[PDB]
Design an enzyme around this catalytic site. Structure first.
Site, PDB file in Angstrom:
ATOM      1  N   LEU A  33      16.443  -0.344  10.371  1.00  0.00           N
ATOM      2  CA  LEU A  33      17.206  -1.342  10.371  1.00  0.00           C
ATOM      3  C   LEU A  33      17.996  -1.247   8.790  1.00  0.00           C
ATOM      4  O   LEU A  33      17.152  -0.814   7.998  1.00  0.00           O
ATOM      5  CB  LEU A  33      16.795  -2.507  10.454  1.00  0.00           C
ATOM      6  N   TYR A  54       0.917  -1.290  -0.108  1.00  0.00           N
ATOM      7  CA  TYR A  54       0.334  -0.202  -0.006  1.00  0.00           C
ATOM      8  C   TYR A  54       0.882   1.321   0.184  1.00  0.00           C
ATOM      9  O   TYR A  54       0.154   2.322   0.349  1.00  0.00           O
ATOM     10  CB  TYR A  54      -0.908   0.313   1.215  1.00  0.00           C
ATOM     11  N   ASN A  68      11.727 -10.336   4.721  1.00  0.00           N
ATOM     12  CA  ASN A  68      10.802  -9.698   5.778  1.00  0.00           C
ATOM     13  C   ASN A  68      11.802  -9.735   7.143  1.00  0.00           C
ATOM     14  O   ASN A  68      11.113  -9.444   8.105  1.00  0.00           O
ATOM     15  CB  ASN A  68       9.368 -10.428   5.746  1.00  0.00           C
ATOM     16  N   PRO A 118      13.175 -14.209   3.716  1.00  0.00           N
ATOM     17  CA  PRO A 118      14.122 -13.581   4.116  1.00  0.00           C
ATOM     18  C   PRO A 118      14.111 -11.843   3.863  1.00  0.00           C
ATOM     19  O   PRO A 118      14.863 -10.866   4.756  1.00  0.00           O
ATOM     20  CB  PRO A 118      15.329 -13.990   3.306  1.00  0.00           C
ATOM     21  N   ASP A 141       3.970 -14.873   6.736  1.00  0.00           N
ATOM     22  CA  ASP A 141       4.727 -14.458   5.704  1.00  0.00           C
ATOM     23  C   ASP A 141       6.458 -14.104   6.094  1.00  0.00           C
ATOM     24  O   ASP A 141       7.043 -13.458   5.536  1.00  0.00           O
ATOM     25  CB  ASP A 141       4.351 -13.011   4.975  1.00  0.00           C
TER      26      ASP A 141
HETATM   27  O1  LIG Z   1      10.039  -2.340   4.178  1.00  0.00           O
HETATM   28  C1  LIG Z   1       9.132  -1.962   5.344  1.00  0.00           C
HETATM   29  C2  LIG Z   1       9.990  -1.680   6.673  1.00  0.00           C
HETATM   30  C3  LIG Z   1      11.237  -1.387   6.531  1.00  0.00           C
HETATM   31  C4  LIG Z   1      11.897  -1.234   7.628  1.00  0.00           C
HETATM   32 BR1  LIG Z   1      13.872  -0.671   7.716  1.00  0.00          BR
HETATM   33  C5  LIG Z   1      11.493  -0.891   8.984  1.00  0.00           C
HETATM   34  C6  LIG Z   1       9.948  -1.334   8.746  1.00  0.00           C
HETATM   35  N1  LIG Z   1       9.100  -1.730   7.660  1.00  0.00           N
END
Ligand SMILES: OCc1cc(Br)ccn1
Ligand SMILES: OCc1cc(Br)ccn1
Ligand SMILES: OCc1cc(Br)ccn1
Ligand SMILES: OCc1cc(Br)ccn1
Ligand SMILES: OCc1cc(Br)ccn1
Ligand SMILES: OCc1cc(Br)ccn1
Ligand SMILES: OCc1cc(Br)ccn1
Lengths: 298, 262
Positions: free
Chosen positions: A87, A19, A136, A134, A131
């Protein structure tokens, strides 16, 4: 709540979700670097997406070092911004760009250990991830790895009800989903971590199928075609077909040859056919494979 | 029993017990609602029951919606003319959280007889989200019930269905039920269902799990037993109609016991 977009300075795009786009930004008052996930509502006709409602509600309550932190949620005008901790990379980018001679075993061992901690914390808080792959899984510069992307996640009840079918990216999807079972549980997340475990060792997916049936077939060629002995009920499952080719289970040492005995033991228990026999994240933390574990840096 | 998460059921139960205290509405928020009453809330809840059976929604979705409504009315004054809009957005939010296939927004507008607009439903959706700060993963009576059901020796579907009906009946009547925690109403409901169908009582195994005894459940249990006796007469009848259906083993047709021996 504790924040407004006045105090963020965009730095660069870092990704894209279902989204919207994710940015890396900098809090101009505290110095903190964050990931902003923008979700647009102006171009939404059914109000706030169900994915975002789940992601936000479930992440609010999962405070744990191996689950990425939702720091805030801002509703500007026609827009909804999720503020996450930042991160530097995901596991897939690291195996592809810095694991050419491979990932060192201490680092595999540390990462799998941390993933199991995060998932156990999920399962202890009535949450399936659904889900784990790697892409994620986010890694920092200090040696930490964190479950991320809860957009497909779901709060479960005890016992579980029928939930959405065909969840989980295909390469990471458990046999019980592929066979169209009425019920699935916490074991589907373990199956995913099992595939991921193997993938960290080889840097290649364990079962890269190109369709549901090809995925099944690849699983069956590796672990053997299941029957009533190894998996009671399998033959009566909705998408089980008697005509299924009956492949012999290959010796497990041939599935991931570099793996030691403890590794093989752990992996075999993550990839057990029967979801009832499959090891939990909680029990896996005590497996001898982790006996000597530490937290070294990327 | 992985479907019953043996390695996590205790962790989960403990957590839900913590979360029900944190997600609890204010007992007696109605006294501080100038323009609405328990009787109006009862009408709304009864309607939400019919909406759910029409769209074949889960029981959990109903329970969540009521949870959202009660918590929302705990901090926001609402004119009687807007009470249904609140309930409508509650039902939409719960459906997006719990339903594989939620109804579309246009269908939520439709069930309000074009009292409200698509724009109104969506703006309220945002308001409820803001007021609850997206804390939508709330424990329900139903989440406790399903765990209590694991302690049947052996499983009885009439017991299960009768417990869900009684727990559902409680959702209608903020007085008294707002003063009990979901976990306690579910316990009372389960014991009453069990006693009614099989003559048996709240099991020792559930004493171990919950800490509750028939002593701790007695007050809620006396109320639920009245609600059950009086249910043929209540102004709201949607739940009884729903629980005539085979899906729920026709449990609303079972006769309540005259006494509890409690
Ligand atoms: O790609 C989605 C996402 C990236 C980060 Br870094 C932190 C949280 N969500
Ligand atoms: O500050 C408001 C807020 C924060 C979070 Br995290 C989630 C929802 N709402
Ligand atoms: O002012 C709007 C805005 C958008 C992003 Br993405 C980051 C910071 N500020
Ligand atoms: O699409 C090919 C296929 C083969 C079998 Br056997 C069962 C289902 N589908
Ligand atoms: O009995 C008064 C009333 C109740 C509702 Br719900 C809506 C409008 N008026
Ligand atoms: O659309 C049916 C309905 C709902 C309420 Br609340 C009150 C009256 N009528
Ligand atoms: O909707 C939350 C709730 C409803 C009742 Br009735 C009792 C306790 N909590």
């Amino acid at each position: 709540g504790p924040g407004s977009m006045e105090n963020f300075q965009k730095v660069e795009k870092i990704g894209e979700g279902t989204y919207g786009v994710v940015y890396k930004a900098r809090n101009k008052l505290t110095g903190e670097v964050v990931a902003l996930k923008k979700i647009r509502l102006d171009t939404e006709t059914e109000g706030v997406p169900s994915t975002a409602i789940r992601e936000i509600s479930l992440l609010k309550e999962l405070n744990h070092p191996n689950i990425v932190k939702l720091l805030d949620v801002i509703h500007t005008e026609n827009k909804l911004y999720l503020v996450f901790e930042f991160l530097h990379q995901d596991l897939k980018k690291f195996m592809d760009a810095s694991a050419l001679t491979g990932i060192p075993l201490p680092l595999i061992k540390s990462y799998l250990f941390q993933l199991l901690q995060g998932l156990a914390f999920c399962h202890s808080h009535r949450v399936l991830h659904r889900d784990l792959k790697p892409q994620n899984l986010l890694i920092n510069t200090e040696g930490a790895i964190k479950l991320a992307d809860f957009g497909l996640a779901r709060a479960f009840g005890v016992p579980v009800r029928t939930y959405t079918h065909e969840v989980v990216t295909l390469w990471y999807r458990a046999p019980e989903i592929l066979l169209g079972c009425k019920y699935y549980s916490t074991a589907v997340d373990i199956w995913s971590l099992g595939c991921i475990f193997a993938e960290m060792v080889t840097r290649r997916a364990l079962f890269p199928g190109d369709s549901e049936i090809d995925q099944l077939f690849r699983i069956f060629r590796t672990l053997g075609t299941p029957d009533e002995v190894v998996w009671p009920g399998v033959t009566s499952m909705p998408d089980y077909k008697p005509s299924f080719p009956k492949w012999a289970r290959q010796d497990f040492s041939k599935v991931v040859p570099p793996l030691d005995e403890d590794g093989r033991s752990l992996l075999s228990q993550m990839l057990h056919y029967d979801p009832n026999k499959r090891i939990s994240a909680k029990a896996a933390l005590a497996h001898p494979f982790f006996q000597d574990v530490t937290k070294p840096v990327p | 029993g992985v479907n019953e998460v043996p390695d996590y059921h205790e962790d989960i139960h403990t957590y839900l017990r913590e979360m029900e205290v944190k997600c609890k509405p204010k007992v007696g928020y109605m006294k501080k609602q100038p323009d609405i009453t328990n009787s109006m809330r009862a009408i709304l809840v009864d309607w939400l029951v019919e909406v759910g059976e029409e769209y074949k929604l889960q029981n959990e979705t109903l329970h969540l919606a009521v949870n959202y409504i009660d918590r929302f009315l705990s901090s926001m004054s609402v004119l009687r003319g807007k009470l249904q809009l609140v309930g409508t957005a509650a039902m939409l939010l719960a459906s997006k959280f719990e339903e594989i296939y939620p109804p579309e927004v246009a269908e939520f507008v439709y069930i309000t007889d074009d009292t409200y607009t698509k724009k109104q439903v969506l703006r309220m959706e945002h308001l409820v989200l803001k007021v609850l700060a997206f804390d939508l993963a709330a424990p329900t009576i139903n989440q406790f019930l399903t765990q209590y059901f694991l302690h049947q020796q052996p499983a009885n579907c009439k017991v299960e269905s009768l417990a869900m009906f009684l727990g559902e009946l409680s959702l209608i009547d903020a007085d008294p039920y707002l003063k009990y925690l979901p976990s306690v109403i579910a316990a009372a409901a389960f014991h009453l269902a069990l006693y009614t169908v099989t003559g048996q009582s709240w099991p020792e195994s559930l004493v171990q799990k919950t800490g509750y005894t028939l002593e701790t459940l007695k007050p809620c249990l006396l109320d639920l037993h009245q609600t059950y006796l009086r249910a043929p007469q209540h102004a709201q009848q949607s739940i009884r109609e729903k629980y005539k259906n085979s899906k729920y083993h026709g449990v609303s047709l079972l006769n309540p016991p005259e006494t509890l021996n409690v």
